Write a protein that binds this ligand. Structure first.
Ligand SMILES: CC(=O)N[C@@H]1[C@@H](O)[C@H](O[C@@H]2O[C@H](CO)[C@@H](O[C@@H]3O[C@H](CO)[C@@H](O[C@@H]4O[C@H](CO)[C@@H](O[C@@H]5O[C@H](CO)[C@@H](O[C@@H]6O[C@H](CO)[C@@H](O)[C@H](O)[C@H]6NC(C)=O)[C@H](O)[C@H]5NC(C)=O)[C@H](O)[C@H]4NC(C)=O)[C@H](O)[C@H]3NC(C)=O)[C@H](O)[C@H]2NC(C)=O)[C@@H](CO)O[C@H]1O
Length: 365
């Protein structure tokens, strides 16, 4: 009994094949939870800015018709929403209450089962506001369920896997009460924003051999453990796994971890964004590359020419799943199913090779 919580996005629809994803591409039995990314906030109220908003509602109802066990949530936030997106809604209880009531009506009208708040990030400044908003939602949700024939709206949150960010942003014990679970964002541990600019893996399970001091923090094992230590019960920890990798353009001839990089990797042809590659792009890149499995860190990286791609593959799916079960975690979260090879047409491994491996690994006694 593990959750498989699957984020998907509303921007992947503008991609060319085979990055071209709509909710209609979703398998109703693939995951236990679906989270739509992202909603917006206009007039201290919840909306959806998506030209496919209405067809999405239609797909939601089809999905839940085919799988009555399926739970679909709505997410607010993300890296680009930032902290700014939550202003001015959080600035007072009045505007906050206006919001919380928009949410309840919204989710009921549209057949969502809860809400994800993935605020990136509260940090020091907004620690208080984030805490308060979560508590007011949690309470309003409970209150609403008091007067209901419906199951109660679930509340989750996408949270930092970064030690310092966790220290600055969260009151964990409070969070443990208010949230049904965290979606631990246990990736983006390394990437081309770093200084000094050196190759590093986006989502390492374990410590690197060269990791010392606060680099010892930048792995999944650590992140997960620190959350539990800070108060979050293990079963409320839902462990994020990525379907993308972080890329680097190599400065010199070192191809190792910690090798100097001139900048982010060449942009994928489909995701057109230098620094990362979806898995369906990674599979093309792997043709003619040399791949190394890191023993220390338990994940692969691939080199082809001056390109260095740290990524996650079927082998790390199964490896990460064993770890999360060993630690009695609540399950697995995926960012994002629409960057797996969902069509099956690039990796020739069937549809959703990575997520499918995760399902199987959780499902296996
Ligand atoms: C002060 C200082 O110097 N501090 C240093 C500091 O940098 C180090 O800490 C590290 O910082 C980095 C960067 O700030 C952190 O990286 C961020 O990590 C979070 C996770 O914690 C990421 O956000 C979530 O995760 C995914 C994957 O990255 C996010 O996905 C992105 O979402 C956006 C939308 O919001 C996507 O944009 C869309 O895509 C295209 C263009 O790319 C466009 O066409 C679309 O229209 C656009 N959509 C929208 C809505 O605008 C983007 O594609 C996508 N990326 C991918 C791969 O899918 C998602 O937003 C987040 N999910 C949820 C849920 O919230 C965040 O993306 C990521 N930022 C960057 C830049 O990659 C890092 O976590 C942090 N590390 C640690 C360990 O804490 C510290 C280290 O301590 O050192 C200091 O020195």
């Amino acid at each position: 009994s593990y959750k498989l919580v699957c984020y998907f996005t509303n921007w992947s629809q503008d991609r060319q094949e085979p990055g071209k994803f709509t909710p209609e591409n979703i398998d109703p039995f693939l995951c236990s939870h679906l989270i739509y990314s992202f909603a917006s906030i206009e007039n201290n109220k919840v909306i959806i800015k998506d030209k496919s908003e209405v067809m999405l509602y239609q797909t939601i109802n089809s999905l839940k018709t085919k799988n009555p066990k399926l739970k679909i949530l709505l997410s607010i936030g993300g890296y680009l929403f930032g902290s700014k997106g939550f202003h001015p809604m959080v600035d007072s209880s009045t505007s906050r209450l206006e919001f919380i009531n928009s949410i309840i009506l919204f989710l009921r009208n549209h057949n969502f089962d809860g809400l994800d708040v993935s605020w990136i990030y509260p940090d020091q400044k907004e620690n208080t506001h984030f805490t308060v908003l979560i508590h007011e939602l949690a309470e309003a949700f409970q209150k609403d369920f008091t007067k209901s024939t419906k199951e109660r709206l679930l509340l989750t949150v996408g949270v930092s896997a970064g030690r310092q960010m966790i220290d600055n942003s969260y009151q964990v014990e409070k969070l443990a009460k208010d949230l049904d679970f965290i979606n631990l964002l246990s990736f983006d541990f390394h990437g081309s924003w770093e200084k000094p600019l050196i190759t590093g893996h986006n989502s390492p399970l374990s410590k690197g051999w060269q990791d010392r001091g606060p680099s010892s923090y930048y792995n999944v094992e650590y992140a997960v453990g620190y959350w539990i230590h800070k108060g979050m019960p293990s079963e409320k920890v839902v462990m994020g796994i990525p379907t993308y990798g972080h890329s680097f353009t190599l400065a010199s001839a070192e191809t190792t971890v910690g090798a100097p990089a001139s900048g982010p990797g060449a942009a994928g042809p489909i995701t057109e964004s230098s620094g990362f590659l979806a898995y369906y792009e990674i599979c093309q890149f792997l043709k003619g590359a040399k791949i190394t499995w890191l023993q220390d860190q338990q994940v692969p990286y691939a080199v082809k020419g001056n390109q260095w791609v740290g990524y996650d593959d079927v082998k790390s799916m199964e490896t990460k799943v064993q770890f999360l079960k060993n630690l009695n975690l609540g399950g697995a979260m995926i960012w994002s199913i629409d960057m797996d090879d969902f069509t099956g047409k690039s990796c020739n491994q069937g549809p959703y090779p990575l997520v499918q491996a995760v399902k199987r690994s959780l499902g296996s006694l």
